[PDB]
Design a protein around this ligand. Structure first.
Ligand code: CL
Ligand code: CL
Ligand code: CL
Ligand code: CL
Ligand code: CL
Ligand code: CL
Ligand code: CL
Ligand code: CL
Ligand code: NA
Lengths: 252, 254, 252, 251
């Protein structure tokens, strides 16, 4: 199943889409600066790109860490990003009441992994009718994603993306099960699957490259960063993605 | 560090406290009946007791699934339970706005395992001044529990209970690391540690697992009856737990 | 099912048996001194006791670290222990050819966890007719112990002990699943189950040992030097207390 | 570090080598039959090839279940495979005494995962001077492979291949950590690393392909698999395409 996001086609048989940006929105000026670099690099390689940032982060490293500029200024910033660069945007929501106003502006709404089972948030997100990025909890099995998808379906929204982030492996460590992408595709109606390589990883650029390449080898709709260094990285991902997507899936 | 809950002393070197009850509040009469059995059984056994139930099941598998009586009905039932039996109660909270109203009624307020990183919920809970039960997420190591505790301390609340409920072990399975209890005591300033045997079993062995955990010298046991233990077996179950706890607590700390 | 080992009754409903001693047999005089201390303490507390050591460490830190005194000298040392103290002894074997000579001297012969699936060693051990201690591999689930047991049963030996040593938990780490004891009892005909706390890993050793013994076990398996040898008495007083309590109550 | 196995160059920046064949040797004819197909497919695709088989299944579930032809007959079959096809071969050894005789015939000798810490077997294998395939145990961290490599070096053999076969993931399940490949390369002096996709698993054809592709994306010396037929062709075409791309990019 493909998802149209403005002029972008997001799907597991389509050229991969890059999701990336900044952690939290501070100001228009800071935002445009970072977004501009992503846009320049991706445009240079012809890679579809969706800008990501949080406007109000509930899961913070410390209590008093800045949550972001908040809903009102945040959405004004996103509106400006969309107008200036002509790209779609993505943000996370954690309050059911925030889903509707966010969806007026943000093309994709993101369900944080820790809230992925919370019924009221899922329903509120579904009812926006927007594209939804479902972050996979690290303690959830790939075949358990079907139940989250079912809850969205119950609430009337099937425009869903599944976002791999790694799985709990003993204490602290995360491991990405390369077989889980296929299990999600098979059990969830071939919805677009994307790979959040950054979470999955907790030199370090070398690790990220190997892990990103391995994931994208399994034929995926997109790559998601919690992030010319970036250009060199994307050249390698694009090379592999173009190879993979240019071949038909195994014959039956 | 001990915590006083009304006349109960909760602590890792005190007699174990039963945090016992049901999955969800369903009606006043059913709640009062179940709670009366718990009170009757624990009183005769001499085990300090705190009644547990959720007012809402916020994360069921269908949006249409029954979620319980809800917050307003729920708090009315807790008020009646407290009035009738004179015991403390515990419930979980799911949204920051729920914390103060729930905390007005419920002695202990609980942070769901799925919501450990909901920093705004942590803050709202801490601000109530109530005793807090922190459910250790299945994805968090025992050494990392200190990070949640730190946040509550930064938010000005030190009346924290640490509750084991198992650790992720491959897909769709949990294991309880018996060493984790000691790690949490060591690294979180010897705050009360309790064991949720009921949610640790998520995938008959409840007694063996319960006894194993309590052998490591814990402030409390957390369990549900109706998976959960048949209510009529509670008395015989608790006889065994009490026998072992009394023994362990009688031995000098090594 | 109980197992008689000389005058000792080993079983999940009997007073726990201590399987204790040392890693590797390095000497004669030091072995006797260490054993003498285990004997004194266990006799003082009235705990059945079986002396343990390896004469040939097959899995060593380095190629050239001492494997131990070897078969012939090892068995001589075991004979001296038996003669001096009148206690049974346990040692491990690694090659089918070692099974007969070892079993003629040693009251229990042990199957190393790493070798527990090796058919030729299993058959050779079984055919001795000796009591056997089966170390559970860390990569093996409790419900699969019955398969090792059935291989022994096929080769004609039912005098089997099941020994817990923890399960792989992410990388370079072990966790002991307290539920595994019950699984083994239920699926393997209530054969004696014992707990190797040493190789499952210190108030740690104490917490872990007590937790395990709380589940009603035939024995506890440990090494000293590993616990400090002089703290043995305090340790066993605590274990005996819990075991005496648990074993004095009928199963529920 | 590359390893020469006859005219084959095995290394992490060389074209991937297929280590392919069957679970166990049953008979000469079927062995030659299966080997012929791998040779035919690999030759026409241009992929270096080493034929794999066990002479003994030392750890089956019943004492009576079938274990293969055994060492004496086993080695006879390998001798004939090398004669007919002129390819190198690989087999696993289970006892120290088997090492020198097996090594006389078999180009690569393999240290089973379960036995990888058996110090006498490590020494015996090292003493043959043969190329050695070290199967990483499912319980062992990738950073711990250097300890096994260190032993072979102290025993005087550095012709070592490191072979991924999955890591224990709860009970009765395996996961392959794609970051382990890089850790092994960085900590073990860039010795050839290969990927046993077959034993890492445990329709399923898509699964094996996806997993093989993911592993080979990390830039590996080889792929270790067992066999259908039509699927072998279909499988290797895709693996080669990916490997050719990856190996053409600068590190
Ligand atoms: Cl998560
Ligand atoms: Cl994100
Ligand atoms: Cl609960
Ligand atoms: Cl959890
Ligand atoms: Cl041992
Ligand atoms: Cl093991
Ligand atoms: Cl193999
Ligand atoms: Cl293994
Ligand atoms: Na004997």
């Amino acid at each position: 199943m493909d998802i149209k996001i403005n002029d972008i086609t997001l799907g597991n048989n389509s050229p991969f889409v890059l999701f990336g940006g900044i952690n939290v929105l501070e100001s228009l000026d800071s935002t445009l600066q970072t977004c501009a670099h992503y846009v320049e690099v991706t445009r240079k390689l012809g890679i579809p790109y969706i800008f990501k940032a949080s406007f109000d982060k509930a899961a913070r490293s410390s209590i008093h860490s800045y949550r972001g500029v908040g809903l009102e200024e945040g959405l004004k910033i996103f509106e400006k990003v969309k107008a200036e660069f002509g790209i779609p945007v993505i943000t996370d929501v954690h309050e059911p009441h925030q889903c509707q106003p966010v969806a007026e502006v943000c093309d994709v709404i993101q369900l944080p992994a820790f809230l992925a089972r919370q019924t009221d948030l899922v329903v509120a997100m579904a009812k926006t009718g927007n594209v939804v990025n479902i972050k996979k909890p690290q303690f959830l099995s790939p075949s358990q994603m079907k139940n989250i998808v079912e809850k969205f379906h119950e609430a009337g929204n099937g425009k869903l993306i599944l976002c791999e982030r790694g799985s709990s492996f003993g204490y602290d460590n995360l491991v990405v099960d390369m077989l889980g992408f296929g299990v999600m595709k098979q059990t969830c109606g071939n919805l677009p699957v994307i790979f959040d390589v950054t979470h999955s990883l907790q030199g370090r650029r070398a690790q990220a490259l190997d892990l990103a390449l391995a994931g994208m080898a399994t034929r995926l709709a997109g790559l998601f960063l919690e992030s010319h260094l970036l250009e060199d990285f994307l050249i390698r991902i694009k090379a592999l993605d173009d190879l993979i997507k240019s071949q038909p899936i195994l014959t039956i």
